[PDB]
Amino acid sequence: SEPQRLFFAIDLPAEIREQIIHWRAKHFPPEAGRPVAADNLHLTLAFLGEVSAEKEKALSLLAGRIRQPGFTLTLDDAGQWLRSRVVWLGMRQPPRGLIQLANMLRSQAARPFHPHITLLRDASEAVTIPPPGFNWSYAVTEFTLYASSFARGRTRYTPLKRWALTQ
């Protein structure tokens, strides 16, 4: 029927989301920027924007043809992009499995890919950016197709399809 705002993403284990939002509430005041909800924390592999039902279906097939071993993400980096006004969490040297998976999703769907997890939005002022917490590392077993929707000015992500990575 009606188009949906879709995107692919890598998710976070529950315990690490909790570890992150605690680390964020320690080094960043409300004045620092707008905090991303715990359940909204993710690593976007490919943003699709408004997609028709026909286009979504074709993408889900192309996504299902992907064959890739799982990989490990260790979040050793955190930073700030001043123009886009975001405080992000990421990885210094991302695994080849991450770069490959993203590029394939960007290729099938089609700014260079710089994998990150947004922690704060509207972070217009510069702020000292501490390093991430210790041992924020986990195994990636799957990637998910998501559809976003904005109810009361609050963002909610709804999962549509999940694909496991070989392992």
**Residue that the structure tokens 């097939």 belong to:** 61
Q: How many CA atoms lie within 13 A of 46 on its CB side?
A: 22
> What is the distance between the alpha carbons of residues 1 and 146, in angstroms, rounded to a whole number?
17
Short-list 23, 7, 11, CA closest to 140: 11
Sign, CA dihedral 124-118-14-19, equals negative
User: What does the alpha-carbon distance between residue 10 and residue 150 come to, in Å, rounded to a whole number?
Assistant: 21
Experimentally determined by: X-ray
Determine how many CB atoms are found less than 10 A away from the CB of residue 8: 26
Q: Please return the burial class of 151, using the count of CB atoms within 10 Å of its CB with bins 0-12, 13-18 and 19+.
A: exposed
Cα separation, 5 vs 49, in Å, equals 5
Run of H or E residues at 9: strand 4-10
Where would I find the beta strands (DSSP E) of 30-167? 34-35, 43-51, 71-74, 77-81, 86-90, 116-121, 137-140, 142-150, 155-164
Instruction: Report all structural domains of the chain as residue ranges with CATH numbers, in order of start.
Output: 1-167 (3.90.1140.10)
Could you give the residue numbers annotated as active site? 42, 116
Paired strand residues for 72: 139
Cβ of 42: how many Cβ atoms within 10 Å? Answer: 19
CA angle 138-139-141, nearest 5°?
A: 140
Burial pattern 109-138, b for ≥16 Cβ within 10 A else e, equals beeeeebbbbbbeebeeebebeebbeebeb
Resolution (angstroms) stands at: 2.8
Retrieve residue 81's tokens: 């992009």
